Amino acid sequence: GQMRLPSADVYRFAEPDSEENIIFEEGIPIIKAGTVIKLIERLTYHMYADPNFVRTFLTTYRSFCKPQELLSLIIERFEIPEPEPTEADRIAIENGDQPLSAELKRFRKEYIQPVQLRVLNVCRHWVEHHFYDFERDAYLLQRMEEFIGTVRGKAMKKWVESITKIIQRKKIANITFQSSPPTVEWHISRPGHIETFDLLTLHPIEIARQLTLLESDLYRAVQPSELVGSVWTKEDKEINSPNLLKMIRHTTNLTLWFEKCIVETENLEERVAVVSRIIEILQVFQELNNFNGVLEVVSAMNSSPVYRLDHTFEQIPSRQKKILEEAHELSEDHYKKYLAKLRSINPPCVPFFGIYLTNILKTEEGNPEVLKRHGKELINFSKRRKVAEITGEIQQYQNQPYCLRVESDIKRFFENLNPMGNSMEKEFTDYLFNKSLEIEPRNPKPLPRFPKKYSYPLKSPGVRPSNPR
Amino acid sequence: GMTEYKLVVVGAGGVGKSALTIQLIQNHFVDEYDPTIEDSYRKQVVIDGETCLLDILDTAGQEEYSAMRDQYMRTGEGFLCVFAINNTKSFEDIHQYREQIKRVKDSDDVPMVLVGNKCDLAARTVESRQAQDLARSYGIPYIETSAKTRQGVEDAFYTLVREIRQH
Amino acid sequence: MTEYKLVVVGAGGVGKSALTIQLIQNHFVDEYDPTIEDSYRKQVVIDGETCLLDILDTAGQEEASAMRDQYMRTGEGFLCVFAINNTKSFEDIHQYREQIKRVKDSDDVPMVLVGNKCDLAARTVESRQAQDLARSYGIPYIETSAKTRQGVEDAFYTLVREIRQH
Ligand SMILES: Nc1nc2c(ncn2[C@@H]2O[C@H](COP(=O)(O)OP(=O)(O)NP(=O)(O)O)[C@@H](O)[C@H]2O)c(=O)[nH]1
Ligand SMILES: Clc1cccc(Nc2nc(NCc3ccco3)c3ccccc3n2)c1
Ligand SMILES: [Mg+2]
Ligand code: NA
């Protein structure tokens, strides 16, 4: 037979499943909706582990349960009453013999120990991967430390002592590769001469490599806490989503810098060299699977000031037109080809974050927080699972590091890039458009000529890497 | 076969803009959505007896990628410019959105509609007369919509398609 | 993109977690934090085909020994890990092998035998003894170091190939 359970009166997590407290989707079950009690029961279920569910729950639960209340509920889950001796045990004890205690031993081995271990696994994952709850609420941390530090008995002892140490390390808080990174490449600007660094004087290969390291680090720093609840769109976005916003602002600044480099090069021949160089940087971005970088370039080329420069585009070599066209086609039909390419490449990569943001926002806006069934309100967990599928995809691409060497001066150059200066956005983008009109006026105005501005060679070194001994 | 219209939703973030397209494309009668689903943004409709296909681009959530607006807008034939009736700043943003659309499309006469969206029960701060006056100054229709009851949603999109057809 | 469910099993402390985190993050974990159950995902191109690895990292401590059927039911292939400086962990391999066969009711489950910590000089299990066992199971034997990365990709990706050809 199945094990008997404690009375639901003394232990709330023994109430029978019903459609008034849990609904499953149509080989472990998938939960569509349930009460918070039923969600926590299945989070720590005695029959099976569900590590995906643990991640999903810990990522999304704050939309239906406060952190303090979650801790109270899992402590309640942990404190399971043991059954009384059975009739056979009673008769043994009455004769002065030791009881077999078969039902008690089975309940310990097959209910209490698995549930308690799975409660501890929730605590371990909570502290390791969602520690911001404790950073933002010191009393919550004290309660967790007290609970873990007072678990008695030898079956849990190894994990209790480990979790205590993990918490202490998290309070006060290295990569190895299959091969060596390639040699850093230099062009007109030489090492240490940061004052000459510019779009055409740095090596286009190394521009793409150093921007990829920067953009990968920015991508890898975004935590799910900055995304759940759509908090990057709300009034406190600067407080709640600072790494995401830093990442987006880098992308915006690089796109605007590309546009500024183009339209401030008034000589046609020089401007063709500038646009060609940016397309070469895009080629290396593609080779590195830096899709954020790819779209940084594509966005600049599609901008109002740049897209209209027909005299410039006319002189771009055919092979480079084809590179730009292939990159542009990634975004067509709601990013159809981008999504397929992302799912086919071999990481490391840098995804474009914007699609994830739109899908999280629309999932949260387009599904209800609760489902009403038989007069009860059940938490709509399917909605949270969908959000956590997206945050899980984000995290999967955050794991793999690039085997590229940092160049500290080139890194600082791109970190400090500020194309807008002290100008506001409208003032600056109007300036860019008026520059575009100056250098290639609307028909039928004649095309003027402009003097050269660059005193160094415009010929590109190309984007195939070199390798001395 | 049937005409396809490429429509683009633009407007301030954080004030319920996404409910407009979600409510349109939704299973009207089941409050549910998976935006990752291939063609969660395509809908076949009949407008004035003529069947057509709507392809709607709504990049809600990407508002901070401000240098991508030109790229996204370039894809569209008609535009829904959306503000929230309880957020005056989103209403004041409309002028610059319209100017940016005109620049990207290189036209002074781009099919577009002004949409005032009621995204919650917080007090209205933009009166309908203010928005009607703005729309009239631009020569475009004004439609008000509810983010919760689906009221006005069909009118907003169908009115824009009529602006395209009569361009 | 095909999805593969890999499970890493073996005695406590042999390096199951260090192996998995080295594969996932290219980072060696010095701490010994006993696992209850962890899961990881990795998109990777193997023999020209992109796939998605789901990796279940399991508990080796004996206190968790009654909770294994549930993860063995779901797994499609198993890394059976011992440490080459721990003879008891090698003797524990056959218990994992037999339990997997029982749960999955199959003599033909994709598996790879992994001898970890091969960066350490002080070996107590000889390669030949482990290779003999692997041959008796019909599976390959791969020595690994979660610390240096030696053999790590080979172990996991060999298991993928055996699931693919199953
Ligand atoms: N030198 C060396 N140490 C290793 C190697 N793999 C793991 N270790 C060390 O061995 C200890 C245990 O590693 P760990 O990955 O936690 O082992 P586990 O099999 O996951 N333990 P459990 O079953 O309790 O979860 C750690 O101190 C770790 O640094 C290896 O290849 N070389
Ligand atoms: Cl200076 C400069 C640099 C790059 C592009 C342009 N101008 C441009 N580009 C076109 N296709 C390339 C592409 C793909 C994504 C963005 O642009 C194009 C196609 C048809 C009609 C007109 C066009 N005008 C100008
Ligand atoms: Mg472990
Ligand atoms: Na307001």
Q: What is d(CA A398, CA A356) in angstroms, rounded to the nearest whole number?
A: 14
Dihedral angle, C-alpha A150, A156, A162, A168, nearest 10 °? -20
Would you call A426 exposed, middle or buried from its count of C-beta atoms within 10 A (0-12, 13-18, 19+)? exposed
Per the CB < 8 A criterion, the answer to whether B124 and B85 are in contact is: yes
Q: For C23, what's the count of Cα atoms within 13 Å in the CB-facing half-sphere?
A: 26
Per the CB < 8 A criterion, the answer to whether B93 and B11 are in contact is: yes
CB contact under 8 A, C33 and A52: no
Q: What is the full DSSP assignment across A122-167?
A: HHHHHHHH-THHHHS-HHHHHHHHHHHHT--SGGGHHHHHHHHHHH
**Domains annotated on chain A, with CATH:** 4-171+354-396 (1.20.870.10), 182-353+397-466 (1.10.840.10)
| Residue C146 marked in a binding site | yes
Q: Is the peptide bond before A224 cis (omega within 30 degrees of 0)?
A: no
What CATH number should be reported for the domain whose range is B1-167?
3.40.50.300
Residue tagged 């198993």 (tokens):
C78
Elucidated via: X-ray
Q: What is d(CA A209, CA A253) in angstroms, rounded to the nearest whole number?
A: 17
Per the CB < 8 A criterion, the answer to whether A231 and A394 are in contact is: no
Per the CB < 8 A criterion, the answer to whether A289 and A215 are in contact is: no
Would you call A102 exposed, middle or buried from its count of C-beta atoms within 10 A (0-12, 13-18, 19+)? exposed
Per the CB < 8 A criterion, the answer to whether C83 and C13 are in contact is: yes
Per the CB < 8 A criterion, the answer to whether A330 and A341 are in contact is: yes
- First vs last C-alpha separation in chain B: 21
Distance of CA A24 to the CA centre of its chain: 28
Q: What is d(CA C12, CA C18) in angstroms, rounded to the nearest whole number?
A: 12
| Residue A13 parent element (H or E) | none
List the structure tokens of A389: 């599928």
Per the CB < 8 A criterion, the answer to whether A288 and A213 are in contact is: no
> Domain locations in chain C?
1-166
Per the CB < 8 A criterion, the answer to whether C139 and C111 are in contact is: yes
Q: What is d(CA A402, CA A404) in angstroms, rounded to the nearest whole number?
A: 6
- Over the range C71-109, which residues count as b (16 or more CB within 10 Å of their CB) and which as e? bbeebbbbbbbbbbbbeebbebbeebbeebbebeeeeeb
Q: What is d(CA A324, CA A342) in angstroms, rounded to the nearest whole number?
A: 18
User: Which runs of E-coded beta strand occur in A279-406?
Assistant: 370-373, 376-380
Q: What is d(CA A259, CA A253) in angstroms, rounded to the nearest whole number?
A: 10
- Over the range C43-56, which residues count as b (16 or more CB within 10 Å of their CB) and which as e? bbebeeeebebbbb
For a ligand 1 pocket test, name from C24, C25, C28 the mutation site with the most ligand atoms within 8 angstroms of its C-beta: C28
Per the CB < 8 A criterion, the answer to whether B61 and A233 are in contact is: yes
Distance B122 CA to ligand 4 centre (A): 10
Would you call B132 exposed, middle or buried from its count of C-beta atoms within 10 A (0-12, 13-18, 19+)? middle
Handedness of CA A153, A159, A165, A166 (dihedral sign): negative
Q: What is the full DSSP assignment across A47-60?
A: S---HHHHHHHHHH
Q: What are phi and psi for residue C107, nearest 5 degrees?
A: -90, 0
A268-287 vs A291-301: helix crossing angle, rounded to 10: 160
B-A interface (Cβ pairs under 8 Å ≥ 3): yes
Give the CATH number of domain C1-166; options: 3.40.1230.10, 3.40.50.10490, 3.40.50.300, 3.30.70.1070. Answer: 3.40.50.300
Handedness of CA B23, B24, B27, B29 (dihedral sign): positive
SS3 A238: helix
CB contact under 8 A, C33 and A166: yes
Q: What is the full DSSP assignment across C44-108?
A: EEETTEEEEEEEEEE--SGGGGGG-HHHHHH-SEEEEEEETT-HHHHHTHHHHHHHHHHHHT-S-
Total number of residues shown for chain C: 166
| Chain B interface includes A240 (CB < 8 A) | no
Q: What is d(CA B14, CA A130) in angstroms, rounded to the nearest whole number?
A: 25
Q: Residues A73, A79, A83, CA angle at the centre, nearest 5°? A: 135
Q: What is d(CA A8, CA B143) in angstroms, rounded to the nearest whole number?
A: 55
- Binding site for GTP: what residues of B are annotated? 14-19, 30-36, 60-61, 117-120, 146-148
Per the CB < 8 A criterion, the answer to whether A212 and B31 are in contact is: no
Hey, of C1, C19, C36, which one would you mutate to test binding to chain A, going by the most A CBs within 10 A of its CB? C36
Q: Residues A419, A424, A429, CA angle at the centre, nearest 5°? A: 65
DSSP-assigned letter for residue A290: B
Distance of CA C91 to the CA centre of its chain: 15
A242-263 vs A291-301: helix crossing angle, rounded to 10: 40
Q: What is d(CA C117, CA C139) in angstroms, rounded to the nearest whole number?
A: 20
Residue closest to A123 by CA, chosen among A70, A81, A173, A171: A70
Pairing, β C111-116 against β C141-143: parallel
